[PDB]
């Protein structure tokens, strides 16, 4: 079959700056009719995948003119001349020379913006949840950049390990920020034994870590 490889696998670009993604095939995509059978697609958070470029260098109708493609044989490039905030997504090349159709790994495009510290909130478990026998404590980091953050849980000043999970949103298409949840899970029995619950957040945008805390349990 034909194997497709993209480089890089991740890009971070300031709005207004150009971005380039390379695609390499394991054999030539140049057909004897003179055309190169390489497409580019984009998949954005919660949307139908979109055709950007076909036959290596042709922009599909409806696609902004900031997009162009080039290359021949086994080496191809998608270029975005001036990135916009809505360009966040994953970009794939696909060869259309042979069956099976094959895709590159995907290249994630992130929009670079100025550093933004998270707003932090902590939520004790509801009285309602405690009836289930489990207690979830939720720490929310809202609207921050960059994505990297450390969240540390302490229970009566004892550091927690192995009992929390994180989830992060896709980058916002307008403000280029992320939000993150950290959820600490313990038995109602263990929750009710301790008094102070705290999440400490460490982030590029915070000169010193921020702690949010509550008393109960």
């Amino acid at each position: 079959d034909i194997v497709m490889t993209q480089s890089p696998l991740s890009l971070s670009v300031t709005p207004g700056e150009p971005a380039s993604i390379s695609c390499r095939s394991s054999q030539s995509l140049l057909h004897t009719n003179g055309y190169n059978y390489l497409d580019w697609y984009v998949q954005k958070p919660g949307q139908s995948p979109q055709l950007l470029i076909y036959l290596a260098s042709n922009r599909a109708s409806g696609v902004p003119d900031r997009f162009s493609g080039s290359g021949s044989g086994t080496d191809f490039t998608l270029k975005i001349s001036r990135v916009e905030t809505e360009d966040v997504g994953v970009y794939y090349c696909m060869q259309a020379l042979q069956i099976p159709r094959t895709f590159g790994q995907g290249t994630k495009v992130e929009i670079k913006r100025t550093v933004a510290a998270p707003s932090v909130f902590i939520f004790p478990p509801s009285d309602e949840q405690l009836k289930s026998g489990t207690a979830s404590v939720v720490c929310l980091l809202n609207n921050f950049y960059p994505r990297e953050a450390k969240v540390q849980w302490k229970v009566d000043n004892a550091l927690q390990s192995g009992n929390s999970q994180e989830s992060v949103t896709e980058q916002d298409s307008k403000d280029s920020t992320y939000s993150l949840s950290s959820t600490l899970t313990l038995s109602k029995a263990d929750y009710e034994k301790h008094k102070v619950y705290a999440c400490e957040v460490t982030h590029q945008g915070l000169s010193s870590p921020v702690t949010k805390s509550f008393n109960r349990g």
């Binding site: 139908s48 995948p49 794939y92 707003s119 909130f121 939520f123 809202n142 989830s167 992060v168």
Partner: protein, 222 residues
């Protein structure tokens, strides 16, 4: 030609069967080859199957050969993918896509355009685990206040969360579901609102889990 919609996806046990459908809106499928492409959990795109305009050329990825069968019906303006002997690793979002090219009478077009109309996708989950509807808990607000709903212990994906019947969208973040140790999913949906509104505005999260036919509303109050 403007849209397609995939349906038929859901939870099935390994060894089981499902039939997916892809229906065209705003154009007719008849002139075109149609492709199925899937995306396994947090991974990239992989081609599954294709069928040409008159059904003489049906192609399948090696991984599904002999297990999947593609077909089409003009009267219904639809393409179908019958999936038999399902495997755990068939778990994926399945997309249908119209190729606008002319294919002569098979894999290579001299009049190529490409896959220009794709659907939103339908999730197929292949697992021995049982369906379970979520429990929904409020995240009560303690300037700007944050509040939310914890949507806990459900299977399979997906759930949908809205706020105030869709009236509240600004400031909403619904987190990607995370698989817990138990093999059940959990997520939170949060929104920020004015602290001064808490006494006079109602906040209700609307949670829908189609796979278990559960629909829950939860009032979030201080």
């Amino acid at each position: 030609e403007e849209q397609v919609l995939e349906s038929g996806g859901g939870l099935v046990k390994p060894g089981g069967s499902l039939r997916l459908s892809c229906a065209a809106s705003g154009f007719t499928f008849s002139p075109y080859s149609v492709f199925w492409v899937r995306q396994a959990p947090g991974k990239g795109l992989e081609w599954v199957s294709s069928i040409n305009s008159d059904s003489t050329y049906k192609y399948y990825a090696d991984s599904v050969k002999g297990r999947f069968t593609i077909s089409r019906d003009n009267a219904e303006n639809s393409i179908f993918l019958q999936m038999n002997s399902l495997r755990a690793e068939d778990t994926a979002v399945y997309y249908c896509a119209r190729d606008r090219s002319y294919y002569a009478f098979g894999s290579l077009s001299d009049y190529y355009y490409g896959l220009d109309v794709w659907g939103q996708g339908t999730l197929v989950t292949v697992s021995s685990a049982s369906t379970k509807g979520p429990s929904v808990f409020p995240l009560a607000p303690s300037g700007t206040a944050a509040l939310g709903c914890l949507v806990k212990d459900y299977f399979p994906e997906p759930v949908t969360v809205s706020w105030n019947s869709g009236a509240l969208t600004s400031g909403v973040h619904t987190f990607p579901a995370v698989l817990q140790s138990s093999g059940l999913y959990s997520l939170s949906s949060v929104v920020t609102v004015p602290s001064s509104s808490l006494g006079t505005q109602t906040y209700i999260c609307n949670v829908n889990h189609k796979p278990s036919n559960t629909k829950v509303d939860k009032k979030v109050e201080p």
